[PDB]
Amino acid sequence: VAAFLKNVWAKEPVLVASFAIAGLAVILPTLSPYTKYSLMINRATPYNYPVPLRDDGNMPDVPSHPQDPQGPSLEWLKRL
Amino acid sequence: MFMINVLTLIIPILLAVAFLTLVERKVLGYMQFRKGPNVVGPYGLLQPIADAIKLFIKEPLRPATSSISMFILAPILALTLALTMWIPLPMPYPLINMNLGVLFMLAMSSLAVYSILWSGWASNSKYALIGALRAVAQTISYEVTLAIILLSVLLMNGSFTLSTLIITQEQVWLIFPAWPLAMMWFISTLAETNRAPFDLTEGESGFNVEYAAGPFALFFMAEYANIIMMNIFTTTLFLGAFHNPYMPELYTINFTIKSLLLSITFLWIRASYPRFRYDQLMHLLWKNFLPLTLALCMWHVSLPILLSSIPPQT
Amino acid sequence: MMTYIVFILSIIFVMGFVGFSSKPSPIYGGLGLIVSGGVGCGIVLNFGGSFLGLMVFLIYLGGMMVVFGYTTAMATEQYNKVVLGTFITGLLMEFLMVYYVLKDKEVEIVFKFNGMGDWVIYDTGDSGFFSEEAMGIAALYSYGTWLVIVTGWSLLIGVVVIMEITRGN
Amino acid sequence: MSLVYMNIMMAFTVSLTGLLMYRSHLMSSLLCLEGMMLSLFILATLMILNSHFTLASMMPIILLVFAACEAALGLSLLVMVSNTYGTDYVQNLNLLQC
Amino acid sequence: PGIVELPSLEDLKVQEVKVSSSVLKAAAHHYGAQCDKPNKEFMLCRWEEKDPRRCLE
Amino acid sequence: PFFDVQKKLGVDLDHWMTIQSAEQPHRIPARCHAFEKEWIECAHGIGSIRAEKECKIEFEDFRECLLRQKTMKRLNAIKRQRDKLIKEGKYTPPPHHSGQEDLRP
Amino acid sequence: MNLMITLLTNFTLATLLVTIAFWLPQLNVYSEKTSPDPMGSARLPFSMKFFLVAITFLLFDLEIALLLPLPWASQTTNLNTMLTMALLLIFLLAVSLAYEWTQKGLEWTE
Amino acid sequence: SMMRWNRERRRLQIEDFEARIALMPLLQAEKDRRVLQMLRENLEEEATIMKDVPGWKVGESVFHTTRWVTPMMGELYGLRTGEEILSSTYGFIWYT
Amino acid sequence: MWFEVLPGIAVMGVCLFIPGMATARIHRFSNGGREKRVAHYSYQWYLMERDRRVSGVNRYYVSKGLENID
Amino acid sequence: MNPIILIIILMTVMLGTIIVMISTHWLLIWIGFEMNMLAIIPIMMKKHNPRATEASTKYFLTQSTASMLLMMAIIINLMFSGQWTVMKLFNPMASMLMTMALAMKLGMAPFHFWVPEVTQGIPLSSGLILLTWQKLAPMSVLYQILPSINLDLILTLSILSITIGGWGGLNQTQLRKIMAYSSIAHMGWMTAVLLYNPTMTLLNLIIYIIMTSTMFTLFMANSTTTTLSLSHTWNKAPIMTILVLITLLSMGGLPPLSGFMPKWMIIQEMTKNDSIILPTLMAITALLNLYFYMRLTYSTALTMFPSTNNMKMKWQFPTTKRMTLLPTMTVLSTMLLPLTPILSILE
Numbered sequence A: 001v002a003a004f005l006k007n008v009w010a011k012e013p014v015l016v017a018s019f020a021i022a023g024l025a026v027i028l029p030t031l032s033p034y035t036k037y038s039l040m041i042n043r044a045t046p047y048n049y050p051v052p053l054r055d056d057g058n059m060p061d062v063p064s065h066p067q068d069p070q071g072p073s074l075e076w077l078k079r080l
Numbered sequence B: 001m002f003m004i005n006v007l008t009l010i011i012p013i014l015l016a017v018a019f020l021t022l023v024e025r026k027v028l029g030y031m032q033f034r035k036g037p038n039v040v041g042p043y044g045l046l047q048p049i050a051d052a053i054k055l056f057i058k059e060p061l062r063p064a065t066s067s068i069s070m071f072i073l074a075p076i077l078a079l080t081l082a083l084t085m086w087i088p089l090p091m092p093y094p095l096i097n098m099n100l101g102v103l104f105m106l107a108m109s110s111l112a113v114y115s116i117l118w119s120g121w122a123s124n125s126k127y128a129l130i131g132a133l134r135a136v137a138q139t140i141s142y143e144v145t146l147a148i149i150l151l152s153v154l155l156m157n158g159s160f161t162l163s164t165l166i167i168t169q170e171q172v173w174l175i176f177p178a179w180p181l182a183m184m185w186f187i188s189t190l191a192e193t194n195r196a197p198f199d200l201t202e203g204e205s206g207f208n209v210e211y212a213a214g215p216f217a218l219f220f221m222a223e224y225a226n227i228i229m230m231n232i233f234t235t236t237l238f239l240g241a242f243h244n245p246y247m248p249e250l251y252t253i254n255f256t257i258k259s260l261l262l263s264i265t266f267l268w269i270r271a272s273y274p275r276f277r278y279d280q281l282m283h284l285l286w287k288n289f290l291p292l293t294l295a296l297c298m299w300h301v302s303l304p305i306l307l308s309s310i311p312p313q314t
Numbered sequence C: 001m002m003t004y005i006v007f008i009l010s011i012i013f014v015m016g017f018v019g020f021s022s023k024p025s026p027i028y029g030g031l032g033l034i035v036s037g038g039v040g041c042g043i044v045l046n047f048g049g050s051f052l053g054l055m056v057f058l059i060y061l062g063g064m065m066v067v068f069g070y071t072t073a074m075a076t077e078q079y080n081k082v083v084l085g086t087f088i089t090g091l092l093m094e095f096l097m098v099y100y101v102l103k104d105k106e107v108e109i110v111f112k113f114n115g116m117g118d119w120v121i122y123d124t125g126d127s128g129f130f131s132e133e134a135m136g137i138a139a140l141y142s143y144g145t146w147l148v149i150v151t152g153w154s155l156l157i158g159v160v161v162i163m164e165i166t167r168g169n
Numbered sequence D: 001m002s003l004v005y006m007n008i009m010m011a012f013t014v015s016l017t018g019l020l021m022y023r024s025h026l027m028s029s030l031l032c033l034e035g036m037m038l039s040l041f042i043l044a045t046l047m048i049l050n051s052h053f054t055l056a057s058m059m060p061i062i063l064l065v066f067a068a069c070e071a072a073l074g075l076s077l078l079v080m081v082s083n084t085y086g087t088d089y090v091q092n093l094n095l096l097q098c
Numbered sequence E: 001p002g003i004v005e006l007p008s009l010e011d012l013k014v015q016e017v018k019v020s021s022s023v024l025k026a027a028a029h030h031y032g033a034q035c036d037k038p039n040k041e042f043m044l045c046r047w048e049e050k051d052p053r054r055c056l057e
Numbered sequence F: 001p002f003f004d005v006q007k008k009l010g011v012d013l014d015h016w017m018t019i020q021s022a023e024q025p026h027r028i029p030a031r032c033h034a035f036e037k038e039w040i041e042c043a044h045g046i047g048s049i050r051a052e053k054e055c056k057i058e059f060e061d062f063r064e065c066l067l068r069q070k071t072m073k074r075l076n077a078i079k080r081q082r083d084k085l086i087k088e089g090k091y092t093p094p095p096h097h098s099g100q101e102d103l104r105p
Numbered sequence G: 001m002n003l004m005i006t007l008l009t010n011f012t013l014a015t016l017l018v019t020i021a022f023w024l025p026q027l028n029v030y031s032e033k034t035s036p037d038p039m040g041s042a043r044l045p046f047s048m049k050f051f052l053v054a055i056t057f058l059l060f061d062l063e064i065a066l067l068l069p070l071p072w073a074s075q076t077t078n079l080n081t082m083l084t085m086a087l088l089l090i091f092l093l094a095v096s097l098a099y100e101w102t103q104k105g106l107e108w109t110e
Numbered sequence H: 001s002m003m004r005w006n007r008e009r010r011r012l013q014i015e016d017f018e019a020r021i022a023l024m025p026l027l028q029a030e031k032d033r034r035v036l037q038m039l040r041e042n043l044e045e046e047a048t049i050m051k052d053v054p055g056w057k058v059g060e061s062v063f064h065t066t067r068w069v070t071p072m073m074g075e076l077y078g079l080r081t082g083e084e085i086l087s088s089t090y091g092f093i094w095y096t
Numbered sequence I: 001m002w003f004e005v006l007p008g009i010a011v012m013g014v015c016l017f018i019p020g021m022a023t024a025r026i027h028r029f030s031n032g033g034r035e036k037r038v039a040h041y042s043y044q045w046y047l048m049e050r051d052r053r054v055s056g057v058n059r060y061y062v063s064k065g066l067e068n069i070d
Numbered sequence J: 001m002n003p004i005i006l007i008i009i010l011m012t013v014m015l016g017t018i019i020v021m022i023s024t025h026w027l028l029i030w031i032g033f034e035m036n037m038l039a040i041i042p043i044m045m046k047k048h049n050p051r052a053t054e055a056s057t058k059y060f061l062t063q064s065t066a067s068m069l070l071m072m073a074i075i076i077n078l079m080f081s082g083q084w085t086v087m088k089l090f091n092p093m094a095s096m097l098m099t100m101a102l103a104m105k106l107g108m109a110p111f112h113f114w115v116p117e118v119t120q121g122i123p124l125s126s127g128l129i130l131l132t133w134q135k136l137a138p139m140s141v142l143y144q145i146l147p148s149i150n151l152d153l154i155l156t157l158s159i160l161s162i163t164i165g166g167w168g169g170l171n172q173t174q175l176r177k178i179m180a181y182s183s184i185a186h187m188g189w190m191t192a193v194l195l196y197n198p199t200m201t202l203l204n205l206i207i208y209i210i211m212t213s214t215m216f217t218l219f220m221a222n223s224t225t226t227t228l229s230l231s232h233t234w235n236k237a238p239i240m241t242i243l244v245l246i247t248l249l250s251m252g253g254l255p256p257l258s259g260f261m262p263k264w265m266i267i268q269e270m271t272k273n274d275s276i277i278l279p280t281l282m283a284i285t286a287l288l289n290l291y292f293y294m295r296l297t298y299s300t301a302l303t304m305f306p307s308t309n310n311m312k313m314k315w316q317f318p319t320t321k322r323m324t325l326l327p328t329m330t331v332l333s334t335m336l337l338p339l340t341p342i343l344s345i346l347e
């Protein structure tokens, strides 16, 4: 597990680098704390028009204006 | 007014290819402890003109061609593709600003093997056909790592737009996150243009030996246009310069200096190494560059996700 | 005349097929299919299929017809009436189609075809900050999981199949 | 319907009748087969781009890839025929009459 | 089938915003802040009626 | 044999690319989204034999959205009559159909 | 449109230079030449290995064609599935390369 | 460096997209009045052209539904000049 | 010595400097002293055609500001 | 072949057919046919002789042409319907092209001209796969598009298949060509009842697959590819002559055997729909199939052809071949007629 590894690093350093970089690419996004922010930034990107809701009278979480407090915010993106 | 812009693209291409031959002979001279041409012009500046006039009044070699039509079409295709690779190049503004300029260049460079193949079959020499098949197999082999390295770099760009690649590199050169991609890219562009140490069309017959001095000169100048173009594309891709939009000539001077140094680096690599054997650069591609290229493609897919550094689409 | 330009390309497209379907030689037929691929790519590009047209160049022409011409040049050792008659037959049938659908603005071979320029069938809106075709191809990795699995498996199996049958053992 | 579809269907039928009437070479047959595939690509593409049906924009690429793999397989078969007779002539492939 | 019902050319007359796209983009954030209410009334009416003729006023 | 594995196991292998009115990336509608939604909501569940004769109107509107044959036939008729009246000289096109009207916005 | 003008200009300049290179030295009256190759007249022997490297190119080029929409596919909101299928496609290209290795397909043009 | 700069580029993309979003109601109102202007002009010229034709309902919908259908390119620019046609139907595709 | 190669490098560098300088000056000449409008997406083309319609001279780059309203 | 590679390639053949069976999108139907063809090509070139390469070339050309016509039918369906559901087709031209493509894949006449060649050119196991497993995916697509299939076309293909598969087998001595013309006749019988009752189509397909698997397994267990080598079986293994006797009398459809079961049920569904001439002429034409079956039984079981001397060596060695499911398939292909109302499990 250690003599074989030094053997293949002596013989085939191209392939050892290949399998090592591939293993990092596989396992490292599951261990990264910033994988969540990739998802959060891709859903924060407004490609479509924010089609507004008809005010039935009881929607306390939906704002009446963009500058209202309620609604989704992007403080985390400006700060990080 | 646009036709003036097309002519000011493609006539300076031919002039730069004309004087690249002089620069190659001079630089290969001084690296070989001799001088290059300095008799014909002052400092040899009339050597490409004299050589063009010599080649265009040399006797036609007059081959018996298997096909007359493809024998005509192969220089036409070579020069047309070697001139159309320049039109999306952002330097700082492209002639044709297209959304998929990277993929356009990859496609038009993938079409360049038909000139080699058609000129090899259009000759009656079977050994010229064998050399053409070896050259085509070499070129299509290194196109694989071209496409995958280029994809792995444009995972940091966000699009296939070549002008966006300047915006991508405003804070740092893209050779810093992608120098292994840069070095395999650079050797793959060295093997695309059949450039030494990958020039087996001069290693012991070329695919275009049945052409006369004029048409072989047209193949030769299409090859050097490809060389300057791929060095400019590598400069845009990994060494992207500062761009003030009110002063575009700063970017033009900067990418021009970097592309000249990279073309001279091609000249300096051919003054340094012996050739590969044919199986040895096949071994270089399939067993060395392609596993690293696939591994780094996995890395450059997963890396903007794990660092939250996905580039924008627009 | 320029409002008919895609139609014009399509005519050349059909002409290109009468190039290789008449089968002069597999190398001239390869050339005719290359020219056909380029003009059909132009047809694709003029509806907004930029990525699909560059797939016609990079993968059909620069990828596959390279291998066709490569394999063909390793056969049919280097140096007709039926070809010429078939070519003029296909060309005259195509120009009779052109003449009918331009004189009548309508024709019916098997289906009814309008004879106006094909610009009339388009949409009059914008797609915002994206190509819709680019986002539909980008959806191959988000929505096309089964399609990716079966395509990549078929390509791996295709590698295995070519290595089994080209060995002779 | 639209006028470009007439030409793309007529191209498919021309490549069909070329593929359904062999002359001598198997390579010319494979070229007619890939012309059929190319016309299918163009026709699918013009429909899907016309209809703005977004998810089927990945469809013609798929139609390319499989069929090009198919083309690869066909080339391999031709080469094996060429490694038996020296030529890819379709009249050499007549042993299975008896 | 039926006859399509189009509004007259008098029903389409309005004082246009005859400024260029850089004028609009430079003022865009303050325009979205200040002109919120008739814009969102219009776009709610536009996604609910699915007909521009019903959304003119 | 339609072994409906996808409905049995609850997986979605290929239903997403099946119709134009399905969930699209970035909510991009097809040009005939409304006609296809109306034809599907008409013909749902009642079977194909009843769906051919009972949902003929929605299906004809949807096919005429897809291929635009009646629309292009009408444009053929109007353009042909206009060209005939231009040839006879009994009609003149207006300035806004000749390009002399300083477009709207 | 500007692209078609540029293609026509590049193709026309290429055709003009090819016409000059094939017909400017034809004006001379040099001499008629009688003129009566490593292989003499032996037919071209087929190489299985050049065909195999071209087919390996074709199959890896199809796998590349699948890989090409990744700079767009990274923008999705189903990123776990996108990353899984991207790594699966590059891994299947790597498995294709490994099987091409281990059955000696990359030999004498390695 | 690519981390910091691509996060800045995503914020700049969101700023551009919200400028677009704030401008979309004005552009939608202008687009609606634009296409209804063009359809009313086409209807009036159909009324003054299609008089001699027997059995012609001017402005007859080809759809059985009374729902608004998005106006096709040939419906809007059918009676106009070829330059306006080409600029509206291949202008963005041919733009460089 | 080695600086004898610099005249050819200078000639070739001027020949590479010409296309970008030329296309920058032609874009500023053809577009009102400004950059060429980059329209990669149909919204950008929509804004550009709106500029061409609101200019009144059939030129997209002729911009109308606050002086065009009352 | 590497046995791992053989397992993966046969799983890919099965994967292609299962993807045809379970998918709801026409592109995945086309993909399943492409995967099936691509994976079955090495099964046909298992022995690497010029007849296998010729057979694989002919098989590739016919299946590739059918795949292109299938995709054109799919694309015309997308024209005239704007969708991709694997259901009825929305154009008679697309219906005709898809019926032609599936007739080419099944090898139904007049697209039958590849079936006796390719089956002759390939081994018995790959011929078994081609004549049993390769029918399942196109019959599934024909099962799901039957509200759009033209009646005149499907019955023309059916009667032309039954007659040509009847006359084709009368001139043969090679066993694989006999099974191939038997295939053409039985596919005619399956498609003749498709628009009337597709459960009987599934019944005929299952009984045909059982009987064909029995006959190919007997031909593999005795290593016989010709009539005259099959006639040496009584001096080598007398039980196998009994088995080929009862299975060939079953495949002709003689009662009380189970191969009488499908065709009778087919007639049972064609006379309910007021077709009397057509199943009568079909049943009279199946006497030709029974005639060359009787020719094989006279050569093998009911007489004793002269053998050779070296047969006496093979008397000292028992069969080491894995005769997989041969007693099970022999019992199922003969003694299943008293269980004829089991067919309701296929509804």
Ligand SMILES: CCCCCCCCCCCCCCCCCC(=O)OC[C@H](COP(=O)([O-])OCC[N+](C)(C)C)OC(=O)CCCCCCCCCCCCCCCCC
Residues within 6 Å of the ligand: A011, A012, A014, A016, A017, A020, A021, B180, B182, B183, B184, B186, B187, B197, B234, B238, B269, B273, B284, B287, B288, B289, B292
């Ligand atoms: C773009 C601007 C320029 C870019 C740089 C290029 C400038 C220098 C050019 C010099 C002239 C070259 C002329 C041609 C040379 C051809 C020969 C050659 O070099 O072949 C390539 C050689 C081939 O080696 P070889 O063939 O000699 O080796 C023997 C191999 N076997 C045993 C199989 C026979 O090397 C490579 O293939 C490497 C390519 C680049 C690899 C970059 C790896 C970066 C580091 C990754 C991580 C490593 C650590 C592990 C993981 C850690 C994780 C935390």
Ligand SMILES: CCCCCCCCCCCCCCCCCC(=O)OC[C@H](COP(=O)(O)OCCN)OC(=O)CCCCCCCCCCCCCCCCC
Residues within 6 Å of the ligand: A008, A012, A015, A016, A017, A018, A019, A020, A021, A022, A023, A024, A026, B290, B291, B292, B294, B295, G091, G094, G095, G097, G098, G101
């Ligand atoms: C899990 C992550 C994803 C992994 C898959 C993706 C990888 C990306 C790179 C693609 C590589 C494709 C081609 C791989 C082929 C491997 C087989 C091989 O090459 O075997 C032969 C070789 C000896 O070479 P030879 O046959 O003699 O050739 C002449 C050169 N001397 O034999 C060898 O050289 C032995 C090679 C195997 C040992 C390599 C060990 C590297 C270990 C790195 C650290 C661990 C990384 C994590 C992943 C697990 C790796 C086991």
Ligand SMILES: CCCCCCCCCCCCCCCCCC(=O)OC[C@H](COP(=O)(O)OCCN)OC(=O)CCCCCCCCCCCCCCCCC
Residues within 6 Å of the ligand: B015, B041, B042, B045, B046, I011, I014, I015
């Ligand atoms: C973007 C920039 C691109 C630049 C490209 C060009 C680079 C190199 C520039 C030229 C360098 C210097 C050229 C000098 C040429 C030789 C001049 C000379 O001395 O010629 C002598 C010869 C005979 O003279 P004679 O009178 O007989 O002598 C006896 C005197 N008692 O007399 C003759 O031969 C007759 C005269 C010949 C003159 C030829 C001059 C050179 C032609 C150059 C063409 C390109 C010019 C630049 C183009 C781009 C800018 C517009």
Ligand SMILES: CCCCCCCCCCCCCCCCCC(=O)OC[C@H](COP(=O)(O)OCCN)OC(=O)CCCCCCCCCCCCCCCCC
Residues within 6 Å of the ligand: B018, B039, B040, B046, B048, B049, B050, B052, B053
């Ligand atoms: C109407 C009248 C005109 C008729 C048509 C003629 C058109 C113009 C042609 C060029 C000028 C004519 C004279 C040509 C040269 C004659 C003089 C000459 O040969 O001088 C020799 C002198 C160098 O002396 P040398 O003998 O080399 O001594 C060795 C050093 N110890 O040589 C030198 O100093 C350099 C000589 C350079 C020759 C001119 C430059 C090259 C030609 C440029 C134009 C054509 C090509 C344009 C570009 C083509 C593509 C690159």
Ligand SMILES: CCCCCCCCCCCCCCCCCC(=O)OC[C@H](COP(=O)(O)OCCN)OC(=O)CCCCCCCCCCCCCCCCC
Residues within 6 Å of the ligand: B073, B076, B077, B080, B081, B084, B097, B098, B099, B100, B101, B104, C034, C035, C037, C038, C039, C041, C042, C043, C045, C046, C050, C053, C054, G001, G003, G004, G007, G011, H092, H093, H094, H095, H096, I039, I040, I041
């Ligand atoms: C043997 C024959 C002769 C051989 C020598 C000559 C031919 C080979 C060398 C030239 C190759 C021609 C390539 C033409 C198409 C290139 C792809 C392309 O158009 O990409 C650019 C661009 C896509 O980017 P995008 O920005 O998304 O689109 C504009 C949207 N604002 O899209 C656009 O800008 C679209 C512009 C309008 C559509 C252009 C259509 C071009 C004409 C049809 C193809 C012509 C070539 C046919 C022959 C091919 C080779 C045989």
Ligand SMILES: CCCCCCCCCCCCCCCCCC(=O)OC[C@H](COP(=O)(O)OCCN)OC(=O)CCCCCCCCCCCCCCCCC
Residues within 6 Å of the ligand: F001, J010, J123, J125, J126, J128, J129, J132, J133, J136, J202, J206, J209, J210, J213, J217, J220, J322, J323, J324, J325, J329
């Ligand atoms: C609505 C229906 C839905 C679908 C239901 C299920 C349908 C099942 C269809 C069965 C198709 C079987 C195809 C053939 C078997 C595939 C595997 C194979 O190739 O087996 C042959 C194998 C090859 O071994 P090898 O060494 O090459 O033999 C030659 C001599 N050296 O090994 C041999 O040669 C060994 C010899 C005996 C092999 C006998 C195999 C019989 C398989 C079929 C059983 C009957 C069908 C199942 C029951 C009815 C289901 C409907």
Ligand SMILES: CCCCCCCCCCC1=C(C)C(=O)C(OC)=C(OC)C1=O
Residues within 6 Å of the ligand: B014, B017, B018, B019, B021, B022, B048, B049, B051, B052, B055, B216, B217, B220, B221, G017
């Ligand atoms: C349109 C024509 C422009 C001028 C021709 C190209 C520029 C001059 C290159 C001359 C040349 C040199 C120096 C040269 O060394 C060489 O041999 C390798 C050539 O190929 C035959 C050449 O063509």
